[PDB]
Amino acid sequence: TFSLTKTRDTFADWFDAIMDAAELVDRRYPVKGCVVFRPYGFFMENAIMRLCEEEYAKVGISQILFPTVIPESFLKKESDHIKGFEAECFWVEKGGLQPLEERLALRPTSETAIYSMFSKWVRSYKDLPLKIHQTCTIFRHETKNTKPLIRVREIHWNEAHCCHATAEDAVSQLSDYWKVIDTIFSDELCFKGQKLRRVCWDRFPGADYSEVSDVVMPCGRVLQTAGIHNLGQRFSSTFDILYANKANESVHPYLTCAGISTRVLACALSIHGDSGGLVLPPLIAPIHVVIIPIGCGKKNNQESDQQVLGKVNEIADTLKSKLGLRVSIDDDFSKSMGDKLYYYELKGVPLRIEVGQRDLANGQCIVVPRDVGKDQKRVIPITEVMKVSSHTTENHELVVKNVIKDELDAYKARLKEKAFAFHNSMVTNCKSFDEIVACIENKGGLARFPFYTTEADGEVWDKKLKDACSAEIRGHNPDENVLPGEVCALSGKPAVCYMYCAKSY
Amino acid sequence: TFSLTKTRDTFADWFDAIMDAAELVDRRYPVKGCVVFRPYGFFMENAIMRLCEEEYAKVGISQILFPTVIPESFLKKESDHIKGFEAECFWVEKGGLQPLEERLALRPTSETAIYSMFSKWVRSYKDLPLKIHQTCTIFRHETKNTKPLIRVREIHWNEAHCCHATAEDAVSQLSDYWKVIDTIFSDELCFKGQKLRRVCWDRFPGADYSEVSDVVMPCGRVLQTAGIHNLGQRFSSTFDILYANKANESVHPYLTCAGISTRVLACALSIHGDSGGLVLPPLIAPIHVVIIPIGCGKKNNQESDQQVLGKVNEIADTLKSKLGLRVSIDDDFSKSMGDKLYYYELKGVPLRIEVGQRDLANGQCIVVPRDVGKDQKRVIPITEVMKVSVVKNVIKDELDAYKARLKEKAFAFHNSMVTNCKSFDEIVACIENKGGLARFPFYTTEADGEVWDKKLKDACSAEIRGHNPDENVLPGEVCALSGKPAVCYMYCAKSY
Ligand SMILES: Nc1ncnc2c1ncn2[C@@H]1O[C@H](COP(=O)(O)OC(=O)[C@@H]2CCCN2)[C@@H](O)[C@H]1O
Ligand SMILES: Nc1ncnc2c1ncn2[C@@H]1O[C@H](COP(=O)(O)OC(=O)[C@@H]2CCCN2)[C@@H](O)[C@H]1O
């Protein structure tokens, strides 16, 4: 029976227990770090990735699918990329009883395979921009201490890869990627991450620079939940991607990529969760609304039951047909309300509506959002609940309005406000080594501090911080401008940026 | 430039040529049988699997995702299953530079993985039924004569697996799978296959029996394009799946499964295609309607061009926003009208809308369906094209009429490729000259029938595919081969 307040000290146990109790994943598959996505959990993952796919389509990035297997000669082409990943590669060496003539790696990430094909698809400036993405699984062997969604050896994800005529287009693409992240993470999943330029000594292998969303988790560690990279022209030279420009000069195009995985789901579940279990944003709720008939099955009350059950159906049909909501009806009269409520709250269903004989007589039903619970139940007339208004805007877009929709939207907005407040509370300004360390140890989250360099010699301080408190310098936000005359918290030299330090997953 | 006629003799080449010219897939990925799905092709495959997912969801089959890797120990548990699939296993043997403790197989199909987990998930009758499906790729190493979508080594597919309390529930599940297949194949993709109980000597390895859709391709060979299987209790025993029933008895549940792959897309493209290239059912058309401004860029005619382009945008906006259709505008004036026509013809765009000054002055536009072409173009008032009011619109009507024309023709093709035979000679003669499916009354559905299968393969390289149990045997009907009373009508064909 799941009942555990979700705090810094308890989160790790809370997460493992909720994974099982809500039947999201099954870790008992006998391959370490390869977890079964069970139905209730997979619906959430699929919803997140479908949204990504949909949003990528709107900004001209086309969905494709590559094979899982990458030939060894592809994977070894780019030096810095392969050294970064070679320990992570599963190798296929036989087909049946016979050895393959060329070994095949299961993709740890798809740059080497995709850019080998870009080399063929890109011959002229006419072929650019070339923007694709795929939703698939990748494979990482060396992943240690596996945790569902957060650190696994088979990882469900989406990767976008774009080929650009110029440096400026490449830079502009990064903003397009960030637009999609904000839509997914904040507008839809109601949480926030710290946007950073990753420290240059820990860039994506092969990248010219790497930008990330480091999300504060309830334990106080950060989780890298988006990776958005400018690969420059390095891969284009290695994989011989060349296009003839308008002057018929042969040019190496720029490459960019963006990746999100099951960690996005990890964040949404973890940040919004409470002592009763899950609290799901509407996007990823397999059931937006559970309607529960109450007080049925009484003696010589078969007629009243039919009327109650009849109205429950008319509510369900309106919510499904007119609003597109996912609705369930729990008409199992053997189960007590206590046991039903436990279960639906455990599973994080945003709204329950209770309809019974008495309330039906008064023309009312009870609507209870998941985050605030029974104490702040809403009495809403049944007529109002059935009330749907619609209009068409200038752009011929249908705008539907309804109280249950309003309640879902208000629910989202409360989750968002609470999640953003949590993030904001876990960014702490520090003016010294000691203040950063005490923050990491006592509070967790991100320690923000002015720092003297964004260049490679900053790694010296990354190591001291790691040794002192196991926190690492994650990066800085270039859009945050340092005040003149501010000094570096660590060296005393003039500050050129604010670095962010944290314990990482 | 693509202009290959699509006949029984040219189909194989026609298929290879249009895969490339339409940029559906890319065979130049240098692992044999592992092809890239390019954007235009992937839209199609994705539309088909999303529909399958949606339909399965509507009948209580929930989507899940299992790992790609299956440990060797799991894979070898069911004797006939492993004998059926061992040759086709890619074996993962190293993690980094280090050999793996236990070999991992890339899933050739997921029964052994999934039923190991059913064992853990099933405890009592209240856990049943348990119904799942997944869209993913599987791996079959031994596949030869690879051909995109039809015969590949990495195969994009959907597989559904259900666990049932009774034998009757398992039989009823097969009917649900079949309704979904009919929806996808016929209602949406506008083609037909022959439903058969697969001959018992050629069942799915580990199945009690197999049901299939064998679809007639333009070359006259048949392609197994759906596989729907009753696994009985065999796997449940092997993987220790047990449930406590209402009377607290420990009993084995019944398992069923169903699979569709990239072959569905293959059939749709192949059956509807013509000498101009693809002809796409609306479900898999990345673009339903291409709108083309015509007669623009003339000397001193910039005013009239912006009127034409303005109206072209108004039509696109109405079709996109009000009706939900996928619409593309080709206003690139640097390209010839001939090159545009050829391209959208080749890519199979259901409808072409042409808008020019001349037609704009009469308040009209030209609508050309892809299947019938410019000889049967429609001249439709623009106000009617813009009129939207169940949603009704003349362009939506043209897409529906187009869809119905595709179905009628593909169904007629199927029907013309089923030939009734009353003797061994007629079967051989049908197979050798006409192709398609040879249907004949036959004395048994059981294992002794394989003697005649062997004789037929030796004569003309055709095999007995199976029989449809729904077909009534005419009173007094005799077996075409033995003269004994017929108990079924077998279907024989050359296979892919
Ligand atoms: N073990 C794991 N378990 C779960 N999620 C993970 C794991 N490892 C990484 N992720 C998730 O994959 C995301 C993208 O990977 P990235 O940042 O290294 O960039 C790229 O790879 C580029 C972009 C696509 C093509 N390559 C990571 O940010 C993390 O959220
Ligand atoms: N090499 C290939 N290339 C393209 N498509 C293929 C290929 N091989 C097979 N198919 C396609 O996969 C389908 C399912 O395979 P099935 O019939 O043996 O049944 C099952 O597997 C059960 C049901 C799912 C879980 N197990 C085949 O009908 C064919 O359409």
| Sequence letter at residue A111 | E
Q: What is the spatial distance between Cα A37 and Cα A17, in angstroms, rounded to a whole number?
A: 15
Q: End-to-end CA distance of chain B: give it in Å, rounded.
A: 28
Closest CA to B163 of B109, B116, B210, B227: B116
Give A198's strand partners. A475
**A65 Cα: distance to centroid of ligand 2 (angstroms):** 19
Q: Which two tokens stand for residue A162?
A: 């774009």
DSSP A205: T
Domain boundaries B418-495, corresponding CATH code: 3.30.110.30
**Alpha carbon A149 to chain centroid, angstroms:** 10
Q: What is the spatial distance between Cα A93 and Cα B445, in angstroms, rounded to a whole number?
A: 42
Contact in structure between A353 and A289 (CB atoms under 8 Å): yes
What is the 3-state composition of chain A as percent helix, strand, coil, each rounded to the nearest 5? 40, 30, 35
Q: Architecture of domain A427-504 in CATH?
A: 2-Layer Sandwich (3.30)
CB contact under 8 A, B89 and A96: yes
| Sequence letter at residue B58 | K
Q: What residues contact A451, with CB distance under 8 A and at least 6 apart? A: A458, A461, A473, A476, A488, A489, A490, A495, A496, A497, A498, A499
Sheet harboring B418-420: ordered strands across?
Answer: B62-63, B130-139, B154-164, B254-261, B222-232, B209-216, B194-198, B463-467, B488-493, B437-442, B418-420
Dihedral sign (CA B65, B71, B74, B76): positive
Please indicate whether residue A137, judged by its CB atom, sits closer than 6 Å to ligand 1: no
Q: Which two tokens stand for residue A295?
A: 């007080």
Instruction: Pick left, alpha or beta for residue A448 (phi over 0 → left; psi -120 to 50 → alpha; otherwise beta).
Output: beta
Nearest ligand by distance to the CA of A66: 1
Q: What residues contact A490, with CB distance under 8 A and at least 6 apart? A: A432, A433, A449, A451, A452, A461, A464
Q: Which two tokens stand for residue A60?
A: 């001209």
Q: What is the spatial distance between Cα A107 and Cα A138, in angstroms, rounded to a whole number?
A: 5
Who among B65, B96, B142 is closest to A141 (CB)?
A: B96
Rounded (10°) angle between helices A263-272 and A39-58 = 110
Please, how many CA atoms are within 13 Å of residue B113, restricted to the half-sphere of its CB? 28
Q: What is the spatial distance between Cα B231 and Cα B208, in angstroms, rounded to a whole number?
A: 5
SS3 of residue B478 by DSSP: strand
Closest CA to B340 of B358, B324, B327, B353: B353
Contact in structure between B288 and B349 (CB atoms under 8 Å): yes
Q: What is the spatial distance between Cα B355 and Cα A191, in angstroms, rounded to a whole number?
A: 48
Could you give the residue range(s) of every CATH 3.30.930.10 domain in chain B? 1-281
Contact in structure between B157 and B225 (CB atoms under 8 Å): no
For chain A, state the CA radius of gyration: 26
Name the burial class of residue A186, with classes exposed (0-12), middle (13-18) and buried (19+) by CB atoms within 10 angstroms of its CB.
Answer: middle
Contact in structure between B195 and B185 (CB atoms under 8 Å): no
Q: Which two tokens stand for residue A320?
A: 């499904």
Q: How many of the other CB atoms lie within 10 Å of CB of A14?
A: 22
SS3 of residue A463 by DSSP: helix
SS3 of residue A74 by DSSP: helix
Q: Chain A window 378-397: which residues touch B at a Cβ cutoff of 8 Å?
A: 395-397
Method by which this entry was solved? X-ray
- Domain A1-281, CATH homologous superfamily name and number: Bira Bifunctional Protein; Domain 2 (3.30.930.10)
Q: What residues contact A115, with CB distance under 8 A and at least 6 apart? A: A161, A235, A236, A238, A239, A241, A255
Measured in angstroms, the resolution is: 2.2
| Sequence letter at residue B161 | H
Contact in structure between B286 and B40 (CB atoms under 8 Å): yes
Q: What is the spatial distance between Cα A111 and Cα A467, in angstroms, rounded to a whole number?
A: 34
Q: What is the spatial distance between Cα B407 and Cα B188, in angstroms, rounded to a whole number?
A: 9
Quote the minimal CA–CA distance from B89 to chain A in Å. Answer: 5
Q: What residues contact B454, with CB distance under 8 A and at least 6 apart? A: none
Q: What is the spatial distance between Cα B42 and Cα B25, in angstroms, rounded to a whole number?
A: 8
Q: What is the spatial distance between Cα A150 and Cα A263, in angstroms, rounded to a whole number?
A: 5
Q: What residues contact A270, with CB distance under 8 A and at least 6 apart? A: A11, A15, A217, A218
**Alpha carbon B231 to chain centroid, angstroms:** 23
Quote the minimal CA–CA distance from A396 to chain B in Å. Answer: 6
Domain boundaries A282-409, corresponding CATH code: 3.40.50.800
Q: What is the spatial distance between Cα A232 and Cα A248, in angstroms, rounded to a whole number?
A: 21
Nearest ligand by distance to the CA of B108: 2
**B260 Cα: distance to centroid of ligand 2 (angstroms):** 6
Q: What is the spatial distance between Cα A213 and Cα A193, in angstroms, rounded to a whole number?
A: 5
Who among A31, A63, A95 is closest to B69 (CB)?
A: A31
Closest CA to B266 of B310, B225, B308: B225
Instruction: Pick left, alpha or beta for residue A425 (phi over 0 → left; psi -120 to 50 → alpha; otherwise beta).
Output: alpha
Provide the residue count of chain B: 496
Q: Which two tokens stand for residue B202?
A: 């050629």
CA distance readout (Å), A46 to A131, A284, B420: 22, 9, 48
Could you give the residue range(s) of every CATH 3.40.50.800 domain in chain B? 282-400
**May I ask the CATH class of domain B282-400?**
alpha beta
| Sequence letter at residue A23 | E
Dihedral sign (CA B177, B179, B183, B185): positive
